[PDB]
RNA sequence: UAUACCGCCAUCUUCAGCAAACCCUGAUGAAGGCUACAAAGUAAGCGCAAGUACCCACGUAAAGACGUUAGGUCAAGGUGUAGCCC
RNA sequence: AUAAGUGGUUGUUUAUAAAAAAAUUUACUUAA
Ligand SMILES: C[NH+](C)c1cc(NC(=O)CNC(C)(C)C)c(O)c2c1C[C@H]1C[C@H]3[C@H]([NH+](C)C)C(O)=C(C(N)=O)C(=O)[C@@]3(O)C(O)=C1C2=O
Ligand SMILES: [K+]
Ligand SMILES: [Mg+2]
Ligand SMILES: [Mg+2]
Ligand SMILES: [Mg+2]
């Protein structure tokens with residue numbers, strides 16, 4: 036019957052079954068998902084199966100300054116038109132079966148390390164194209180509600196940084212991943228630290244910090260050493276601009292305590308000039324590659340002092356057993372100093 | 379080249395003098411003392427961050443050191459005048475309901491702004507949504523009382539710091555001055571003290587706003603010749 | 604590997620620029636093969652070239 | 655942009671550092687006035703602690 | 718919960734027209750009838766034949782002006798006449814619109830044995846009443 | 850095959866809540882955001898409400914979100930998947 | 936201040952994409 040035929044909108048809504056009890060509470064567990072096809076896509080008004088040519092609709096109205104009459108394509112000619120239509124559809128479908136190469140982060144199926152591009156441009160023309168954004172952690176967190184039940188939210192941790200000392204991080208909570216990436220990405224640029232770097236490649240001193248239950252032991256290294264540190268630290272270091280450093284994470288390795296502790300330790304990094312000013316004495320660098328050449332890296336801009344700081348023969352510093360363990364060739368881990376790709 | 383002349387004659391010139399607006403003449407230790415600015419709260423109310431500024435306890439009543447109040451008060455007035463001269467938006471924030479009328483009047487008289495009312499959440503950290511995307515936020519905030527009506531720091535003190543807005547603040551012995559850019563230790567309860575601060579910040583602002591006019595008239599004379 | 608995906612990259616002792624890329628600019632050391640990813644074959648040829 | 659980390663450094667240090675980095679393109683209106691006439695104590699956030707044990711307040715009684 | 722001819726709320730991003738935005742309990746209150754004839758008046762005949770004609774024409778027009786209609790047809794009848802008032806879009810060639818007006822009018826007049834007219838009203842975009 | 854669905858409904862509902870977008874709090878955890886002599890929330894939309902129908906400002910209708918019960922209905926019609934085609 | 940026992944089994948989060956169709960002759964009748 037002609038009168039039982041419905042519209043494409045009504046037909047796809049039923050066929051796709053996007054709504055229903057299956058969607059809710061993950062009751063339906065059929066990963067295979069059909070997609071709506073617009074079947075009007077390649078359709079031309081006036082073009083039909085019989086191949087008639089209607090002047091003013093399917094073909095041009097006037098030919099050689101004269102009004103065309105009703106004409107019908109030849110059988111052999113109509114075959115080509117129908118055959119060509121099949122080809123375009125196939126090639127149109129071909130485009131949508133091509134798999135796009137998603138550049139992978141820490142792992143193939145991991146969101147950590149993946150880049151979210153620059154933060155969205157601000158309201159009043161504020162622009163953030165200098166900054167990069169890498170994901171640090173995606174987690175489906177749940178709460179219970181009286182009506183629905185298990186309600187999923189996405190907690191996302193991102194870090195932003197221009198690679199010139201300015202960097203931050205923020206958490207984003209939303210029901211949709213893409214809405215949490217936005218919130219986390221855009222909120223981070225309003226919470227930027229400035230991380231002082233020694234020679235714009237490493238840190239000034241070595242940092243030993245404990246944030247809650249996470250321990251981070253960071254070591255200043257020379258050039259070429261590279262970033263030999265936890266995969267989340269290398270990411271954040273690339274966003275800060277540190278290029279050569281070592282860090283070992285002990286205790287708990289919660290991504291969020293590791294981040295909040297990494298940025299805290301780096302924020303308390305005392306500079307060489309800040310030191311010279313605090314002690315009021317020259318800070319002299321001794322490099323083994325330069326013999327006893329006394330390289331003065333920072334001097335007190337204010338008044339210089341005259342009393343040699345008392346040199347305590349025995350330093351009352353609390354050493355770390357692992358440091359001394361390795362120093363004395365007692366640590367024999369079959370995992371330390373392994374050949375790894377350049378970071 | 380107009381940038382060099384405009385910047386030097388207007389913005390850079392006043393910043394080269396120790397007291398470009400002569401605000402030190404506006405107050406004296408005798409004037410502060412006569413306004414009871416040295417009277418603090420009792421010793422059981424004291425904040426430990428306000429100790430550097432307390433001269434002592436006179437029968438368990440903290441006496442604020444007016445010698446440091448004067449040095450701090452000058453620094454706070456100097457900043458205010460330089461900001462008023464630079465066409466900065468100055469907001470006066472208080473919640474002491476006894477002086478809300480006084481502080482609102484004073485703000486209108488010097489052509490500036492006052493928020494003496496319940497501070498709604500996000501006025502500063504969420505202003506482009508509460509006002510409009512092109513709203514201009516204050517460049518300076520003057521707290522005449524830094525505690526809200528439950529004896530805790532006004533939320534704006536923290537929100538000003540989050541928005542990178544310098545603040546001037548009268549900090550009594552029970553107040554928290556860690557985040558205030560220019561704390562001025564002094565009594566914030568006595569009407570004499572509150573009248574004095576309003577008189578001083580009004581003058582400093584007024585005087586600074588005239589001088590900004592009385593140094594662009596010289597620009598006009600210099601422009602002709 | 605980097606070398607074996609571009610035929611126009613000839614690891615010769617004459618191609619000094621290419622050789623420089625595979626040596627530290629700070630310590631003067633030839634990277635290990637896992638560092639850059641060049642197969643065992645090419646890394647040895649490279650090593651000879653460097654020397 | 656700006657940094658709303660009111661607990662890390664001060665408005666000066668944060669601003670100063672963001673200008674150096676290139677985030678803040680324009681020095682805020684108050685920056686030059688602060689730089690010329692800085693306050694006696696830099697406004698850095700500190701958490702008030704309790705005095706345990708023998709720690710007492712250095713405030714003396716005026717006699 | 719009632720469902721008939723309600724567009725559900727969604728997420729504040731769904732463009733809906735004044736017609737679509739109103740539920741059946743608003744049909745004589747905030748909106749009118751998409752057809753007007755005398756069949757459904759007390760004492761009148763042929764409500765059925767009018768109704769079959771109106772279901773066909775809406776279908777006829779939807780497939781005859783594919784992708785052009787920007788709202789629902791307004792069907793009118795005065796004596797022997799039939800008026801089809803479409804709101805269409807402005808993407809098709811006016812040559813094609815004139816072809817289709819002349820075509821539809823002619824074909825429908827021979828099908829329903831009456832004078833049939835077709836009044837187009839073009840709009841740039843579909844008029845949005847509300848973002849549900 | 851209603852446990853793939855549209856369509857049209859039951860049910861709480863003789864409900865008042867669902868909320869995008871922000872901001873803040875929790876050491877940047879799941880989460881949380883209340884005081885009017887106010888102490889961090891602003892919220893567009895959708896319900897409720899208002900309006901309209903019936904003989905009124907009353908009453909009765911109607912309305913009544915988001916969700917809950919894989920609740921009902923492939924036998925209203927249409928339809929994804931699977932099957933039948935002497 | 937009475938007494939109110941029980942309920943086979945089972946169950947959830949693997950990742951983005953887009954079209955257009957269209958425009959040469961802007962006014963006669965006429966004749967060889
Ligand atoms: C075997 N049980 C788990 C079951 C299975 C199906 N269907 C299938 O698994 C079908 N599987 C195929 C697709 C054929 C491979 C089912 O479809 C159902 C149910 C449960 C029933 C229970 C029904 C019950 N009464 C009417 C017998 C009832 O009162 C309730 C209730 N909530 O109170 C129901 O949920 C019930 O009506 C219902 O809907 C069932 C199913 O839907
Ligand atoms: K079926
Ligand atoms: Mg009902
Ligand atoms: Mg069902
Ligand atoms: Mg159903």
Ligand SMILES: [Mg+2]
Pocket residue numbers: none
């Ligand atoms: Mg089952």
Ligand SMILES: [Mg+2]
Pocket residue numbers: none
């Ligand atoms: Mg009523």
Ligand SMILES: [Mg+2]
Pocket residue numbers: none
């Ligand atoms: Mg009812």
Ligand SMILES: [Mg+2]
Pocket residue numbers: 912
């Ligand atoms: Mg109502």
Ligand SMILES: [Mg+2]
Pocket residue numbers: none
């Ligand atoms: Mg069922």
Ligand SMILES: [Mg+2]
Pocket residue numbers: 941
């Ligand atoms: Mg039993």
Ligand SMILES: [Mg+2]
Pocket residue numbers: 942
């Ligand atoms: Mg049980």
